[PDB]
Amino acid sequence: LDPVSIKSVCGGEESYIRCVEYGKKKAHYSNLNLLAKAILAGMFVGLCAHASGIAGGLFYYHKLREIVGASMSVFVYGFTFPIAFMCIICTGSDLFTGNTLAVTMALYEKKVKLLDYLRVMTISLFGNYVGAVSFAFFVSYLSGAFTNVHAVEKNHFFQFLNDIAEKKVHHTFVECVSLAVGCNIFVCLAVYFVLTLKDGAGYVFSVFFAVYAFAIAGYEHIIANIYTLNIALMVNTKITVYQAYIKNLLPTLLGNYIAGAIVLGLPLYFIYKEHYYNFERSK
């Protein structure tokens, strides 16, 4: 006897087509369903961010730092954080960062009209913001986790956050923009990874490595940064709204959109636009 082979891989035309169709479907939903999907996605992001911050603050201890700095903490933070996108995608959710590439690709192919593009993007952005800030208020702020203690021994869950936030509010426009470009490149790949492996083992680990690289690299995300900076504002961490909404979030937003539609959408449309035709004529 001899077993039978299974094709657990299919790339190229297949993946691009899957992504364009994904972007196409997002049209014939309704406003409420997209709203809810986006809010759930924001909730998941915020939850995994809470978890990763607590890990980091554990490893960001009074004395470890005098030797090791912020390495172990950022590492475990990155290690803990990617579970979120698995939740998001396998729940049926909508992420603004993940929708840039797919839906602008469906736009380029002249399937999703413009008003649809705009309302989908706006609703997803709004819902993600809602989810993240909500989870920042109810679950985190009321849990007394990241609150100041005035004890060098015990306050290592505060400094960490503070530090990270104090880091994201001193860069310049160009810096944040490029870092967000890198972020969205990664997460778009991560999305491409989950629309291509078509198996359980492949999804988890590809998305894991993508998001771990994103985190350990120090890049920026409009949905993660919202959570972090809002909650740091809830604790009276040494930042303000100016330093957060007016300085950082707009850079990250524009960088994500760029890396989504231009850096990675135009090339992919150009390369494959001629094989997406032979699939639409047949059917």
Nearest approach in angstroms of CB 177 to a second copy is 8
Applying CB under 8 A, the span of 45-53, 96-104, 107-115, 244-252 interacting with a second copy comes to 45-53
Task: Find the part of the chain contacting a second copy (CB under 8 A) among 101-109, 158-166, 198-206, 231-239.
Answer: 198-206
Nearest-Å Rg of the Cα atoms of the chain is: 20
Does residue number 32 form part of the binding site for a second copy (CB under 8 A)?
A: yes
Using DSSP's 3-state secondary structure scheme, residue 146 falls into: coil
115 binds a second copy (CB under 8 A): no
String of contacts with a second copy for each residue 203-242, x by CB under 8 A: xxxx-xxx-xxx-xxxx-----------------------
Tell me: does residue 51 bind a second copy (CB under 8 A): yes
Spatial neighbors of 204 by CB under 8 A, at least 6 apart, are 86
Contact status: 89 vs a second copy (CB under 8 A)? yes
Residue 234 region by backbone torsions, left for phi larger than 0, else alpha for psi between -120 and 50, else beta: alpha
Q: Cα 21 from chain centroid?
A: 21
How many residues in total does the chain contain?
A: 283
State which of positions 135-174 bind a second copy (CB under 8 A): 138-140, 142-145, 153, 156, 171-172, 174
Tokens, residue 181 = 């470009």
Q: Is 207 left (phi over 0), alpha (psi -120 to 50) or beta?
A: alpha
**Interface pick for a second copy out of 113, 149, 152, 270 (rule CB under 8 A):** 270
The reply to whether 263 sits near a second copy by the rule CB under 8 A is yes
179 binding a second copy? (CB under 8 A)? yes
- Counting residues that bind a second copy (by CB under 8 A) gives 106
Single-letter amino acid code for the residue at 170:
H
Count of CB atoms within 10 A of residue 177's CB? 20
